[PDB]
Amino acid sequence: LLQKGIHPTIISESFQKALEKGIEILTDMSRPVELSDRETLLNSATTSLNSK
Amino acid sequence: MMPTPVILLKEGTDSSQGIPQLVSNISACQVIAEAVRTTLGPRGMDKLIVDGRGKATISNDGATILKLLDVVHPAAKTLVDIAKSQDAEVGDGTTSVTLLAAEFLKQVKPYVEEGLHPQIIIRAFRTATQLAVNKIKEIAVTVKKADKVEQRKLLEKCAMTALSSKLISQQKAFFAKMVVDAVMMLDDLLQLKMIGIKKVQGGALEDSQLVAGVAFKKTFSYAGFEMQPKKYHNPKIALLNVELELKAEKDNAEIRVHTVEDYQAIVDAEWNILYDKLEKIHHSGAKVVLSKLPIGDVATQYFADRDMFCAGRVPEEDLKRTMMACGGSIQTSVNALSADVLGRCQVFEETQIGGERYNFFTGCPKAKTCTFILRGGAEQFMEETERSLHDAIMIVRRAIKNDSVVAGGGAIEMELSKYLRDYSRTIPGKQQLLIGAYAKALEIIPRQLCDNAGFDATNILNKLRARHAQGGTWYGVDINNEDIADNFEAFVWEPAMVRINALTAASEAACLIVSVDETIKNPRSTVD
Amino acid sequence: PLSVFGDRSTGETIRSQNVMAAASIANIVKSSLGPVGLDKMLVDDIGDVTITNDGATILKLLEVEHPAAKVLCELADLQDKEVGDGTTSVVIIAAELLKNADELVKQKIHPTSVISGYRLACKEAVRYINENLIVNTDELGRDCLINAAKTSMSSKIIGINGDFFANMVVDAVLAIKYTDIRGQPRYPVNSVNILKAHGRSQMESMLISGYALNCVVGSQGMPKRIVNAKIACLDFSLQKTKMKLGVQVVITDPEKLDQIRQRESDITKERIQKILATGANVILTTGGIDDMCLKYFVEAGAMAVRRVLKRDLKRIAKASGATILSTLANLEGEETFEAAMLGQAEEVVQERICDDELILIKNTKARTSASIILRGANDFMCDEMERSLHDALCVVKRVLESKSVVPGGGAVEAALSIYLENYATSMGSREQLAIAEFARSLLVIPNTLAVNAAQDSTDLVAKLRAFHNEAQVNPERKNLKWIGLDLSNGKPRDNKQAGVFEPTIVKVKSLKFATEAAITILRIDDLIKLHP
Amino acid sequence: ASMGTLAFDEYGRPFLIIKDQDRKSRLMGLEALKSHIMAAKAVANTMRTSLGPNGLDKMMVDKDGDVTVTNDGATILSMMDVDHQIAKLMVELSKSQDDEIGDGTTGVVVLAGALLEEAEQLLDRGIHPIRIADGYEQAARVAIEHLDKISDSVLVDIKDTEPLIQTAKTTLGSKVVNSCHRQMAEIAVNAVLTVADMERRDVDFELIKVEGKVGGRLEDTKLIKGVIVDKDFSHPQMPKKVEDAKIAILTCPFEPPKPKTKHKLDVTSVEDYKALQKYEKEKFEEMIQQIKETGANLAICQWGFDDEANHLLLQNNLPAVRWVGGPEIELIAIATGGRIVPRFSELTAEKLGFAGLVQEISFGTTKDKMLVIEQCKNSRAVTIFIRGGNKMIIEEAKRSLHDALCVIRNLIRDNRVVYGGGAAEISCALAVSQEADKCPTLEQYAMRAFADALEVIPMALSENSGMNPIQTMTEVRARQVKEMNPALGIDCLHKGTNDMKQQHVIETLIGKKQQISLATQMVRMILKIDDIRKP
Ligand SMILES: Nc1ncnc2c1ncn2[C@@H]1O[C@H](COP(=O)(O)OP(=O)(O)O)[C@@H](O)[C@H]1O
Ligand SMILES: Nc1ncnc2c1ncn2[C@@H]1O[C@H](COP(=O)(O)OP(=O)(O)O)[C@@H](O)[C@H]1O
Ligand SMILES: Nc1ncnc2c1ncn2[C@@H]1O[C@H](COP(=O)(O)OP(=O)(O)O)[C@@H](O)[C@H]1O
């Protein structure tokens, strides 16, 4: 982007805008979870431990 | 160990013996194979090696890489030696020999570690090698038709297969057609020195040309050379080995005169000798004069005045190629310049090729020689192009000797592995394990092709094994489709002698490495 | 680009380096496996000499730099700590597992698949061992313990004298048997004091029916032998009394100084008078005793020993029924010693052992104790004797605690190899290869055993595998599971009948530890070595 | 990640395979390719500032302290003291481009750097470098075919030299001689068109003698239809100007003859001495008379002469110049239409050359004299005499004129041209992108990376000119797509139009094809290296 001739302030503001849009997208992809749902907690723990 | 006041051998003598030293030898061979492992197949890569002086060599050829490595391990030097032997006898497959030898040693390493006698391993290797060579000779495909078109197609396919691993693989069809055209013009001995190879910087690979004649670079023209015409439409060529300039008649000659008239006569006699040689050359009818010895400025101006071309200090190989292309004879004396000793060509011309002048002899109908003019962007680019063309030329020469082919891409080796496994299933059992290990080691080349191409080698090897078990001799690795295919119908063809020599050399190297049980290194003398 | 002050190795380079380090560590000790193995003699930089056959001792004395090699050495140490035997076998198995796993990885098999296959193979091997290859010791009697001790002491300096040493070990272990809560018998090995003294041959080593002290009487005037000993064990010194840091003596009237100085020793005199008045004959203390108290004991005609080790004193006190006293203070604020605090023994003797003397407390009551005095040609041989004796004691303890044993001589390894090679075909596609490699790597033990004897390893291993395959396939040939290796004659042999036994815990723990170490090393594919 | 491998055996025994293996480094796999791409990118980014009319120069100092100020990319890379092997590869790429074409030695390096930069991000996504090279080759073939399609043919007739002058001006625009731009282009075009074989044959560059002398002004540079010589008349009292000179070109020193063979002449009496003295005097007189008999006005020798011959030449009204170099002798003979004579006895009137004016030229307060031979009848050799205020600008003018001569030589070789200013690059990138939309998906990434690397030239041109690179390049590309006009490029000089055809920004088609081909092949060669084994 810098080699193309863009100042590193338009890049920063554009990255901030993209981050806000991405936060919106990720929140849209979310799914409510209840702490009483043990299966979801077990799945999350297994996913965390899968790479170790 | 005890001090032993007077020692047996001199100090610094290192001795290694037993199973550990042979395991170390196998490991060193593995290292040497890994040094050239990645340069195999159409998806192979190149290695860059910098010498002490700072010059770098970039190559895909296994023999060149192994030679450039300063290998000092006594057991590891055998792989370099067999690579050189394969390059000398065949010219192609210098990577496969090292891969196969190291794979044999790696496969028999576990039996070495458990105390198996090396003689049993050597006998099993010899038996397996004999069986594999006989199988290759039996199943190799040959055509008993002597058809010119079919022979040309076979040579071109073999050349493309030999070329489809180098940086010139994109123009492999074009370069293979050039190579087959060049080799087919050699008469009966297929001498390599009859195929000149000139590398000129600049130009694309497709700009390289094959001259149906002889071409060589301009050789230090004198004054008055630019006054000579640079194109002739039916020149007679005088091939000479004569120094055409004013000089002492002999090194030991001495002239003694006591009269000014005799002094003038001697000067005029020297001039008359030179002019007599020049007039004898001119009266022969020749328009182009080439000499292995220097041609002076006086002779150059004399030829310019007669509208004739001269070129002195021509390299001997270029003169020999010119003689073979034109049909004359290199004359050390100009006293008998008959028409039988003068070369003929349809067109002679001096042209510009990338900031360098070259002399062209084209239109020769009876030429027995060629000249490649390779174009590239760098010195190592053209050097590697020359190496690839040399591989292709050697392959085409061997195929000219005999048109026996086997499908490449590991198909022949998978068939050999299946045959050897089937044979090993029907023997007592001490040799059965070793012959099975030999058959398994035969699978390294297709596995290495898959690894270099970035596939999953295990699944491809399983599919190849299943296909070979159920029938189909020529199923190998399809690099483009990431699968298996009938490599004979895909024209991945190799001369049978390539694999025969590869197996023979790899087996001999493995047997020699296994047969050694002790290594002794005497202390260095004259370290300076 | 990284700009890290150090060296970085990534991928095949570091994997091969780790495998090379593990293989070197294995090859160091591979020559010391099985009854035909031979000892190694290690020399320190200061000239100290250690002659040993134990893998743990060799790997502890060695100075190691590579992290994977350190992992293997700590694996050997852990196997020694948790089992006591099979220290060489676990290292060899772990290195072979790592080598075969790396060979699989070089074939573009993902390391996670290899790890999963190794875990499955280890679990199935443990299950198969527990369900098929274990032998209950209830039907074998005392001969099972003797056979286990003989098998353990093979390859050791005391192997040929095993007929004697196995009886000694079994008696020593049985002498310290006790049952804790839940009614489970326990065998606290390391409670058998082992004393090493060069001198007479191995066959004249003594098993003491009591305890042996590496101590002598405080004064030459004391008797060297007491018949009916009343042992008093003290945890305090018997010296002239000195006030603490917080107490100071300041004299203003000179007439009090002599009384102060007299009481300064009269306190200890009174304490010793009480201790002797209770009727004690032998007094053992962890603290020192000065000349005055020694003379009190001499006049009393009693044996007094000073600077007794705390563990030795605890063992003696509990074997004889005495109570350790760190002070003569009761719950009434007074200074009393009671006869109920006295231990009893049938004899206490200071005997001479090779121009030196030690104290033997013979036949302690209310509890049986055991001590072993090893006689050898020199110090190094006695040290190797002690190491081998400890190995045998640990093996017997494991056999007595868990009453299952497995045949030795590589029978378990061959059976597991055959079973796992058969079983791999029913699990996955690449974990199949991992389980097959696990089974193949399990054969390194019989191969090394045969190699050490200069026998035909290939043919013997092939015969063993054929026997075990026949046992597993044929349903009425289940008696062939005990076919092991007879290294003396180089032939297969029914090791269950021959008496070559091992505790099941040795094999199970070795398998689990080797698998975990191999997985840990295989988990590495990149090394950053920061510059110091 | 270096030093190779070290195991020292799994038994503790020494493990030595390669001599001095502990002092030899080794790079493998993707890391070596990343390092090579980084080095090539550094070289290309260094060179990309010297592109276009607004490009800047590099002041280069050799090991001896001599200063060279230049814009030629080949010269910069050749004089640059590199140690990296990939940098040497880029230097050789520039040298090969200079050899084959003579112009565009900077575009090839920038193009190769851009190609490798795109290949870096392609490799990061898990593509085999051979696949990237194959896609680059496919896109290069497409671009070369498109260049052939969009080329235009110019007339290379001597009667009308306007397209040739425009092409030479485009070549010289980026050089320091843009002050004398049109004059330099005209003299280069005329020089090439003079020494040329008309039937589309070669142009012999050693028939052009490019020589420069300090002093004067850069505008004083002129094309002489003859030969300029660094010598002067042998006698100080000889006339300094000869008109309608009939030149006798000789390669024999004006000295008594001597055989080449070892010879001894014996003097045995006074009569012998007198005869020898008379013989020497008569030889001098005879050679002077033989030269004079042909009617020649000027004598040119190669090996100098002695005092008696010099005074006889002055006394007989024969201006002469001695110690003229061999190449200068050949050039004088070619220009004046005379033969080179090896001895006086062979001299004839028909072997005499002709020159309308032979003059000795002074250069201010410098004491140095040079000889000018011009006004020849049908001279087939030319010399370019360059003046300037310092030797650095003279060397740079020599390089610039060589570039212009090479460009006109290429035009002689092939008379097809394309319009520069990045217009050809933009059109080729558009063609490659359009072709990528049809091929299977796997090579699409390589073809699009090739298009992006092609688009670096207009971006570099716009950046050097101060305008925004991406915006200008996008606008020009959109205009090219909308209205079918492959001549729209970067308006580097701010002339108010983007049409390079109107601006006469013309460059040879063969040069662009060579640029693309060389860059693609060298990028393929670099991409195939995966191991380095420096000592
Ligand atoms: N088009 C192709 N498809 C599949 N395999 C090929 C093809 N061309 C060559 N090979 C295989 O690549 C292997 C190595 O060939 P190459 O690298 O050219 O020379 P070397 O044998 O010296 O390594 C050969 O065994 C051949 O079978
Ligand atoms: N009498 C015997 N006959 C055959 N094999 C034996 C005998 N005694 C021990 N072995 C085998 O030798 C192997 C090696 O034991 P050893 O190395 O001495 O123990 P450790 O592994 O604790 O050092 C054991 O696995 C055991 O099965
Ligand atoms: N007057 C001009 N207007 C726009 N672009 C130009 C002009 N003159 C030259 N260029 C461009 O500048 C680029 C670089 O040319 P130059 O620096 O002269 O030689 P090289 O190609 O060796 O860098 C060429 O591709 C050409 O298209």
Ligand SMILES: [Mg+2]
């Ligand atoms: Mg080949």
Ligand SMILES: [Mg+2]
């Ligand atoms: Mg043991």
Ligand SMILES: [Mg+2]
């Ligand atoms: Mg230019």
